[PDB]
Enzyme design. Sequence first.
Site, PDB file in Angstrom:
ATOM      1  N   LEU A  85      87.535  65.216  24.917  1.00 12.51           N
ATOM      2  CA  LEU A  85      88.200  64.272  25.782  1.00 12.51           C
ATOM      3  C   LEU A  85      88.191  64.724  27.251  1.00 12.51           C
ATOM      4  CD1 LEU A  85      89.711  61.653  25.723  1.00 12.51           C
ATOM      5  CD2 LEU A  85      91.758  62.935  25.045  1.00 12.51           C
TER       6      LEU A  85
ATOM      7  N   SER B 200      84.734  64.227  28.434  1.00 13.42           N
ATOM      8  CA  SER B 200      84.492  62.799  28.589  1.00 13.42           C
ATOM      9  C   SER B 200      85.132  62.234  29.858  1.00 13.42           C
ATOM     10  CB  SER B 200      85.047  62.042  27.379  1.00 13.42           C
ATOM     11  OG  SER B 200      84.584  60.702  27.378  1.00 13.42           O
ATOM     12  N   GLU B 201      86.384  62.603  30.111  1.00 11.06           N
ATOM     13  CA  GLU B 201      87.102  62.123  31.291  1.00 11.06           C
ATOM     14  C   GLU B 201      86.641  62.763  32.602  1.00 11.06           C
ATOM     15  OE1 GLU B 201      90.012  59.650  31.510  1.00 11.06           O
ATOM     16  OE2 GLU B 201      88.733  59.103  29.844  1.00 11.06           O
ATOM     17  N   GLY B 202      85.785  63.777  32.522  1.00 11.07           N
ATOM     18  CA  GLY B 202      85.299  64.402  33.739  1.00 11.07           C
ATOM     19  C   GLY B 202      86.207  65.409  34.426  1.00 11.07           C
TER      20      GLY B 202
ATOM     21  N   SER C 283      86.998  56.486  29.415  1.00  8.35           N
ATOM     22  CA  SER C 283      85.651  57.019  29.188  1.00  8.35           C
ATOM     23  C   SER C 283      85.185  56.865  27.739  1.00  8.35           C
ATOM     24  CB  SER C 283      85.580  58.484  29.604  1.00  8.35           C
ATOM     25  OG  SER C 283      86.428  59.268  28.782  1.00  8.35           O
TER      26      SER C 283
END
Lengths: 154, 154, 154
Positions: free
Chosen positions: A15, A18-20, A126
């Site tokens: 996560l 994914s969220e950067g 995301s």
Amino acid sequence: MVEINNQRKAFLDMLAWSEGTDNGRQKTRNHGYDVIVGGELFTDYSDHPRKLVTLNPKLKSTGAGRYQLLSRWWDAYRKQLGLKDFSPKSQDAVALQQIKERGALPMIDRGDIRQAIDRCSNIWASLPGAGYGQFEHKADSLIAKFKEAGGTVR
Amino acid sequence: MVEINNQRKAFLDMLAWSEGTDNGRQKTRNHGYDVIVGGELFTDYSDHPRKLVTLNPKLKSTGAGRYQLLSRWWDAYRKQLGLKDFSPKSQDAVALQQIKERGALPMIDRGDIRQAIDRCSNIWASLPGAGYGQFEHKADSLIAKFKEAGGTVR
Amino acid sequence: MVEINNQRKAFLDMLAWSEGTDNGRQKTRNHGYDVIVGGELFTDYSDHPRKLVTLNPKLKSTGAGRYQLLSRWWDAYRKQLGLKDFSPKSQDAVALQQIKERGALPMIDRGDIRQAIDRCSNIWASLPGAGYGQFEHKADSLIAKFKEAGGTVR
């Protein structure tokens, strides 16, 4: 509090990637736990930074922390869970609580990651939903990151 | 990078005791620096042993060394800090780096151990509040151990 | 086939509008039921057209029909519901089935549209998820459409 185990931890890492916030590109002094939407960093962990960022003339967000939690949701959960700060542990707590409420924990624990991702898509931008066109493609990358974080897929 | 001082050394000893690698009961030939999760020992210090003792998805662990560092974290830090081996000095370096990242160093240096423990619970499962299914020591027992290691509490 | 009532019909109309198949601008000979992702129309209703349309290098999709159903989900549901064609009735059936599986039918029936939208966001890309930056504003425009389709909000 929702308990952390190897499957859940791997999900949180996937996560963050994914969220950067924790992807080895975005700058951070603490694994994405200090990231504000847009890329700036904060240093005081006693509360959500609450910085309103205008990502473009038509997009605003208050996402902060490793999982890009919005300030309004932070307030709801801080009260509900009795959290005293916005430290990394508190951030993990809120994310796990949201995952719990979506009924995704059993899916994560058993290795049904594709389903967990779909269930959690309504919380994190995301993550793709299953009815969307790019799901199968995005889920592969996500599943790969989940696996390298030590998670086991079924 | 992070230099060691009396307060920090005492914190690392408290940690080794808490994690069960250096507590006078777990077998070791080197103060817990050779302990693999589960209780077996390794002798080659050129790298993390990279072993697990269970394939159970929720319980899986690769913790090794005095502070039970996971292999995935080892790889990240080895590269980041330019470490050439998994020797006791390297193990101490990684632990101190992780403590530095959670903002606990000033807390340790000044004697605010209870706060340092809370900040570090996100890294080590034996630290109270960690939230895994494992046994967590009471803050009191931890502070007592910290003091006998020569640390001063405020 | 799930039963249709006024609340459910209004939700399907809001959805067709949201997805851009039946919005007064996209060309159609049958209220969006003949729309292929990208804007092309089909005339044979015996099966999903099964065209993979490239919207841009990173985005491909097989969405077709009033609710832009992906071919892989069409195959799953065709089999499961015993559908003999991709006629408007069949398209409605699949959409309602997906809504049922997300537990949103009671929400729709009672008028809790904001909740229903959030629950269904993982199926339809035009619907906003609750953890999304601008949920409340997008939900407002959808609620308006739902009401003009004859639906009653609580």
